[PDB]
Design a binder for this molecule. Structure first.
Ligand SMILES: NC(=O)C1=CN([C@@H]2O[C@@H](COP(=O)(O)OP(=O)(O)OC[C@H]3O[C@@H](n4cnc5c(N)ncnc54)[C@H](OP(=O)(O)O)[C@@H]3O)[C@H](O)[C@@H]2O)C=CC1
Ligand SMILES: NC(=O)C1=CN([C@@H]2O[C@@H](COP(=O)(O)OP(=O)(O)OC[C@H]3O[C@@H](n4cnc5c(N)ncnc54)[C@H](OP(=O)(O)O)[C@@H]3O)[C@H](O)[C@@H]2O)C=CC1
Ligand SMILES: NC(=O)C1=CN([C@@H]2O[C@@H](COP(=O)(O)OP(=O)(O)OC[C@H]3O[C@@H](n4cnc5c(N)ncnc54)[C@H](OP(=O)(O)O)[C@@H]3O)[C@H](O)[C@@H]2O)C=CC1
Ligand SMILES: NC(=O)C1=CN([C@@H]2O[C@@H](COP(=O)(O)OP(=O)(O)OC[C@H]3O[C@@H](n4cnc5c(N)ncnc54)[C@H](OP(=O)(O)O)[C@@H]3O)[C@H](O)[C@@H]2O)C=CC1
Lengths: 445, 445, 445, 445
């Protein structure tokens, strides 16, 4: 096959850029999709009964016609994140309503409104053909993908593309995701693949890594500096693990909170010492449904002061929202910043404002990451200061159980999946760098 | 009485520094105070029936001993602030708690832990005597005073004195307040008296104006900018009256929220066009005790777009708190700031975090201002760009009446208090500069 | 003649979008042109004997093809910026330098290097057709176009598009600039055309006014706040005419620097009072080619303190470069900001670093404005807050004389140029708003 | 002797705060002092020839009266700075000249108006007596000192105490410095002693460490973040050594410039990989006394890139000044920061402003450090993330010889001076944390 010929080119390790420019398009590429008719076959099932292995079809799909500022990507590996499972489960709504309302933009965007939806918001691969006006990416380049597609027509997002109102998540709100052998992205979603990682490790950190980078490291978020103390609220989790790594490498002290010594172990494995087991310590910040227990804030406060010897956290890395958020405002040191990018336990937060104004704290909402923030996060991955958190890797044919595993926190870390890659372990090109931190790269395994 | 010999020296106009330095110190002075035999007199009862007239006393108290870095000041006039209302009704907790808890600590701070507490967080007057090490001021100096008391012994407040862990509010978290004939003040709260205002006018702005300056104008606050749209709650009130002015003088367009049509015309007198009488529109942002009404939020946003031309506010000047805060978060422009220095209607804020993280908004805590911001605020008053909003003056014997006027929303500007000044109209040493801005000066009548 | 149809359809007052969409395009258009033939045929003599009239050509150049994300705009009027001065003057190097070898990249960047260069970096006109991918802008939309041009596939520009390494400047560092009949722009350069202004008025602020806004008003620049003092060099000129408006409207104090009592009195007209004439005081900041005299800085510092009653300027709006920059750093208040967007008198700046590091000042380089800043500056104009500063108006044929008058300082604010607009005075569709500020709108003529 | 009991108290351990309070103060203490009658012995002679061994007296001296907000310190160890070297030298001005009229200030200040000047601006010792009002420190606390004295009577330094006009460096512009066995300092000069260092090591970080901290790390300085690239000039020197450690502890990449292989290796022992021998590469940034050689700027930029792999530096840690500044401004990344602190080779800076405004770079001036920056800089030392750069220790008797060594660059790191301490190596109360950093602590061996 032609599909075969390209894989051999990637695997050769000697295919020049022009070699790639010479490989022919296959008319089809297998894909993990959803079919527009199977929407309601799932309405009325709980936290687990709606199931992803049923609505996930492995289709042979026609190749999209590319246009300006876009790249066809041969996908070695991708992943299954939260939006992937949710779409596979048609939560919250049906992603075909995204594809159709996003089809009202232009004829090129109409390409996305199709009977099927190719899922996938991550990507590690080789670019094959680039569209009109592309200059920055030659065929043959090893890439990962930032999953924020911005159109950038309104002026809003020209001092921060995260402000741009037409922001879409590639593979979730547009089509041609990465859970597939071929893919189409905007070249301003492409990032240089780190040479010391596997294909599967390379596309693992993804949105969750850049999201924590902007929230913790960038000046749009809390502007971590060396010496800061930072409370991190789900440290072994996706967001928290990378947020832990950034604290350590930025020169700061993570304080990691967890709900099992299994989770506590992964933070030690990453470099953390100061770890709180919120379940071991019996924290009940809400005495009921409507009222909080301010002594439960104070109890965590003093527990924090144990690992630090008196100081409070300059920064709280928030995301559980409703349950944690009262305490996280309380515990923050005077003039400190609470930064939020999610509200998993409930989006209606309640806090004691006295603690905000009298102590001059600030809550700063954060969301995803712009391309420059996504770049610098991927950069820190590429330089060896931040590490992928892969745990299980699947094969393309079994993306269902890939997404039922994530559907029930079956793993502690990320779930990658080989696409064109025949087996795991390929991709490296800087084995030295890889051997310097092998110890931590596969910590979540 | 040595006190009348002090007042007569002010009223002369030619008493120089050597004359105040020679004048004899009284042994007692008249002061409004709370007693620690009355500290729970109001307990178990509706916050509203809690009458300030039943808790405030006219007393004679002995002169305090002056420590290093302090000015003893003969107070011509002071003002009623909302923090005096709260002292007067022992909410949210009595002020004798932190009088004791900063009292017998260092011996010097032990001078404040008295059975009585004189209030008054503004003053305008003449320096009587200075403690050791004072160089910037001398007896006879004409002075107004802000209410920040910082020890500045900690490292923490040396990049912004507000972060001093021991920053107090003078006359509220400390004794020897300015609702009184003499006040005991750190020299680093002193600022020169605006020579065109009267005694009671000049004592009007210092607390509230400074706060609104840090909150709105400062880079430590919302860092407003010309052309911003700014939602200003309680826009005729204390903070509102200077906040509106800062939005106006800054080239911003305010949307002034008021509770009354007559008070909707002081804003137009002030220069504002965008006025929302919240009692007229009848917002019920809270459905019950525990549930807000997001459609009342949206109705508020609709009325703002009415004025701005479909634009959401860059900045919301918050201070109503609980009742208002949900709405405040909703209508704020994407990337906008919710800057809060208070919680009048309740400090247990609740809000939809989804509008904050996903729209990249910020809730910035504010609290008074550092000496630099107070200097800058008063400097603006002195230049005739910002103007006092004095509406009524009471006498030191009727201070408890005034506190009631503002406890209930009875009066909505700034209500003054004569201390040693026996009439109004005393104080102007710059008649011509006062002749230019008289109409705005007398705008709050 | 096709060009007539367009101008006729524009000149009417009911031309629908489908009117402009059906209209036929001319095979060519009149345009002001530097010739790469005359590259070094004026190389050797001083650039003043290089009168701009000799190098600028009026050529009937053909239409380039309308590329994606681009718009073909019929241009009623442009303006002269002195980035056209040393376009014509060919200094420090010819514009064809960073034009010619930018083709081997993408073929669509190659259209820009011809043997000719259409200059001009302002525009008021009407869009003809839109490139691929463009939804926001429709034929018949009346638009101004600021001159920021960014490809934005590099990630560096995604926190602010002006950190794009491919940020060029249309008409100065690209082809097909505003001094023509039609213009080829990126649609992300298009802004609402203020509807109360004429074609020529609406075209004048674009460049200088965005630069000034970003340089002085945005946090990316000086960050003006109310009460600042602001030394504005060239307050009369194209940059200064907006800076002065920003100082006054943001509530700060401008100290205006001019070289003619005529330009003083128009500054006084705009509302300023603290005015200095660098002809009259006779400032020699340089004793010779290589040395300065702090006696003269001090004397400049002296005069400034006359106006402000003892206060040094927080902000210096710099741009004359080497002759003033040394004086500008000395004069600025401690903790203050010298912000700089060019170097008219020469780019090798010389300053005494003691005044910088010991006084905590900062020098901030500014360049143009990202789209958001361009939209905020144009929004203020449109809102009637900032006014255009048109001086003279020329027809396109006499652009060389326009550039010569500015290149000699024989001018005041902005020199306009008619392109398609047969006569001055056309374009106004809000005479109500127009007739409210006409005295300040025509202040400069 | 009274002094031996104090020493004995300290060397014992044991001595509780009570016993330190009970111990008897000496009538006098031994000290190094300048004599008011000697300001002119080194008149007309080369600075190299001027000899502190003749100027520096070893006098027994009465201790001053203990003022408010002041602490009496038994200094175990001190250091010698360039500020100290110039004092011994009577350069630039006579340091007695400053005492005589800062004495003329308050009667408190007047205590420094002596015919002798105890020099010494770094401190390692034990608090003996507190003055009035002190709450943070008690008799027996182990302290180092920040050498900045601020009055703070002015509001200018209440947003950052470096803006306080009446600011002095203790032991240079105040008397009772730390080259003595007792020293008198304000309480807000005091920092806790890193428990793992010896007395002379804990006195070596001092002003150069905190200056580097504020210039690089603080948001008053460059605000470095992890992943940043930083050109550090003189990276083996005082500023540069600490600047290098700050780049490495915060997860950035220092690019160290040095002028010999023997210093290049010191940088490697500190942790630096990228190092540039200035004099090996032979950079002649100045063709002569007036013109620069920009292709030497370019060659510096080329070598930096070879280290970063293509990336220009986000931050240049400047301080050499005229010789280096053109290159510093040239090679910094688009949108990055030159942070300058001093100008050793010359304060008359010259640079091409084209690269400043067009690439949106900023020159930020920084001076010393406020107390919060000094606390945080000291604290990172205590964390064991920053280490002191001591290379040689003298006894108090040899302070004159020590002063010549630094005056003749006889050493690379800092020259400690034992004061009360008998031998080297005393003072470590945390041997385990010392063990884990030992080779880095002694890396200036
Ligand atoms: N990644 C991104 O870019 C963005 C993600 N989001 C949100 O991310 C998802 C949230 O999961 P994500 O962080 O990405 O990865 P995870 O699936 O690993 O998140 C699980 C973590 O959340 C913590 N947690 C959950 N509930 C609580 C609680 N009641 N109290 C304390 N901690 C709690 C848990 O910590 P513990 O071990 O202590 O139980 C757990 O480790 C949302 O679906 C949404 O997408 C939002 C914006 C951006
Ligand atoms: N943190 C700090 O440093 C400082 C904080 N403050 C705070 O400001 C106080 C506000 O009062 P102040 O500015 O002194 O002068 P006022 O009391 O006169 O103004 C408060 C205004 O807020 C409006 N308001 C009251 N209740 C509500 C409500 N439930 N919803 C919406 N708006 C309401 C009212 O105006 P209307 O009814 O007409 O709309 C009232 O005028 C806060 O309580 C707090 O004390 C003040 C100074 C400093
Ligand atoms: N970085 C960028 O992207 C942009 C920069 N610019 C700026 O344009 C120039 C400002 O001029 P512009 O607004 O375009 O129109 P002008 O060139 O006409 O205005 C320049 C003003 O600078 C005044 N000036 C003051 N001192 C000197 C001096 N020592 N030597 C020469 N002129 C002096 C001039 O006369 P007078 O004394 O009467 O005031 C003149 O009015 C700046 O140099 C800069 O290029 C403009 C747009 C964009
Ligand atoms: N009156 C004066 O002379 C002035 C002195 N200064 C000083 O600046 C600060 C320097 O601090 P500090 O680090 O402790 O001094 P150090 O003695 O510890 O070393 C400073 C480093 O500066 C480097 N350096 C010296 N000259 C040059 C040059 N021409 N180009 C590049 N690098 C150079 C050298 O590094 P290497 O040789 O290895 O490359 C030298 O080691 C001082 O605090 C002081 O204020 C500042 C302004 C004026």
């Amino acid at each position: 096959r032609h599909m075969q010929e390209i894989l051999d080119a990637i695997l050769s390790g000697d295919a020049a850029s022009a070699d790639y420019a010479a490989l022919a398009l296959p008319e089809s590429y297998r894909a993990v999709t959803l079919h527009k008719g199977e929407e309601r076959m799932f309405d009325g099932l709980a936290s687990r009964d709606k199931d992803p292995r049923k609505s996930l079809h492995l289709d042979d799909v026609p190749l999209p016609e590319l246009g300006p500022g876009e790249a066809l990507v041969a996908v070695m590996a991708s992943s299954v994140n939260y939006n992937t499972v949710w779409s596979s489960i048609f939560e919250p709504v049906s992603t075909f309503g995204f594809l159709e309302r996003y089809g009202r933009l232009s004829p090129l965007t109409a390409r996305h409104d199709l009977p099927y939806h190719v899922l996938g918001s991550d990507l590690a691969g080789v670019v094959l053909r680039t569209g009109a006006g592309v200059n920055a990416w030659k065929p043959g380049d090893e890439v990962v993908a930032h999953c924020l597609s911005v159109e950038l027509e309104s002026p809003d997002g020209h001092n921060d593309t995260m402000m741009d109102p037409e922001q879409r998540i590639w593979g979730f709100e547009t089509n041609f995701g990465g859970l597939a052998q071929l893919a189409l992205v905007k070249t301003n979603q492409l990032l240089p693949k780190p040479k010391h990682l596997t294909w599967e490790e390379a596309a693992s950190p993804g949105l969750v890594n850049s999201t924590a980078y902007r929230q913790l490291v960038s000046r749009n978020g809390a502007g971590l500096k060396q010496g800061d103390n930072v409370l991190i609220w789900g440290a072994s989790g996706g967001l928290g693990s990378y947020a832990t790594q950034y604290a350590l490498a930025g020169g700061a002290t993570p304080i990691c909170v967890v709900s099992s010594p299994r989770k506590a172990d992964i933070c030690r494995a990453m470099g953390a010492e100061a770890i709180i087991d919120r379940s071991a310590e019996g924290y009940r910040f809400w005495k009921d449904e409507h009222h909080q227990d301010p002594r439960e804030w104070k109890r965590l406060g003093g527990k924090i002061r144990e690992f630090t010897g008196g100081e409070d956290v300059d920064i709280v890395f928030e995301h559980p929202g409703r349950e944690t958020f009262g305490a996280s405002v309380y515990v923050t040191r005077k003039g400190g910043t609470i930064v939020t990018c999610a509200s998993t336990s409930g989006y209606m937060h309640q806090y004691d404002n006295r603690y905000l104004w009298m102590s001059l704290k600030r809550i700063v909402g954060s969301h995803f990451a712009n391309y420059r923030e996504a770049f610098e996060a991927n950069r820190l991955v590429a330089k060896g200061k931040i590490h992928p958190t892969l745990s299980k890797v699947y094969a393309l044919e079994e993306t269902g159980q890939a997404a039922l595993d994530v559907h029930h926190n079956k793993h502690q870390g990320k779930v990658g999946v080989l696409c064109l890659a025949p087996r795991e372990g390929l991709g490296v090109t800087d084995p030295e760098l890889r051997s310097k931190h092998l110890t931590k790269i596969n910590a979540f395994r």
